Amino acid sequence: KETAAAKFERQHMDSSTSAASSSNYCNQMMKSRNLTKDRCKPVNTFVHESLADVQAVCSQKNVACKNGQTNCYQSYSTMSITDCRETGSSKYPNCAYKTTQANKHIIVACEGNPYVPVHFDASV
Numbered sequence: 001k002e003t004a005a006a007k008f009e010r011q012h013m014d015s016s017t018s019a020a021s022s023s024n025y026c027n028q029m030m031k032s033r034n035l036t037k038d039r040c041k042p043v044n045t046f047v048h049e050s051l052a053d054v055q056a057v058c059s060q061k062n063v064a065c066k067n068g069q070t071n072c073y074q075s076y077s078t079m080s081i082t083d084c085r086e087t088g089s090s091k092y093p094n095c096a097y098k099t100t101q102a103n104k105h106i107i108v109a110c111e112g113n114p115y116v117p118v119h120f121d122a123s124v
């Protein structure tokens with residue numbers, strides 16, 4: 001039922017806040033977006049921009065994906081993001097995360113028709 005595009009929105013879109021600036025944010029969000037269900041997702045980024053702005057990245061700077069595929073795109077502008085990284089002492093199911101805010105260019109992979117983000121590759 002859940003499309004790749006919907007999964008990208010679930011894992012990575014958080015337009016509601018301008019910057020994920022609670023120290024609790026990743027702990028709460030990693031759980032509520034179901035990224036700690038079968039295991040602690042080791043790293044995940046949330047993007048605090050409009051869906052339209054993030055979708056627009058698929059028409060921006062074409063760059064090589066980490067996996068060597070050619071369908072990745074880097075945002076021309078920096079975007080407000082939050083990096084969530086599993087702590088060294090995090091143990092499933094009690095997944096624990098460090099919350100870090102940044103403004104960085106995002107790199108996403110795009111697929112499909114319509115051509116939309118389906119994977120978050122990197123922030124630079």
Ligand SMILES: O=c1[nH]cnc2c1ncn2[C@@H]1O[C@H](COP(=O)(O)O)[C@@H](O)[C@H]1O
Binds near residue numbers: 044123
């Ligand atoms: O949400 C995500 N999905 C997939 N990869 C991510 C996500 N967020 C960050 N990353 C990548 O994971 C890296 C951290 O892992 P590292 O290679 O051990 O340093 C970051 O530099 C990002 O490129």
Ligand SMILES: O=c1[nH]cnc2c1ncn2[C@@H]1O[C@H](COP(=O)(O)O)[C@@H](O)[C@H]1O
Binds near residue numbers: 044
């Ligand atoms: O490029 C892609 N297209 C569709 N699904 C992907 C792609 N890359 C990874 N996935 C899968 O969907 C999830 C994407 O998470 P992300 O890499 O953090 O964005 C991963 O857990 C993979 O299982």
Ligand SMILES: O=c1[nH]cnc2c1ncn2[C@@H]1O[C@H](COP(=O)(O)O)[C@@H](O)[C@H]1O
Binds near residue numbers: 121122123124
């Ligand atoms: O200019 C860049 N090229 C490639 N990765 C970058 C760059 N700037 C920041 N990064 C981030 O740093 C990670 C690579 O660092 P590494 O794990 O030490 O190899 C990537 O996952 C990116 O998210």
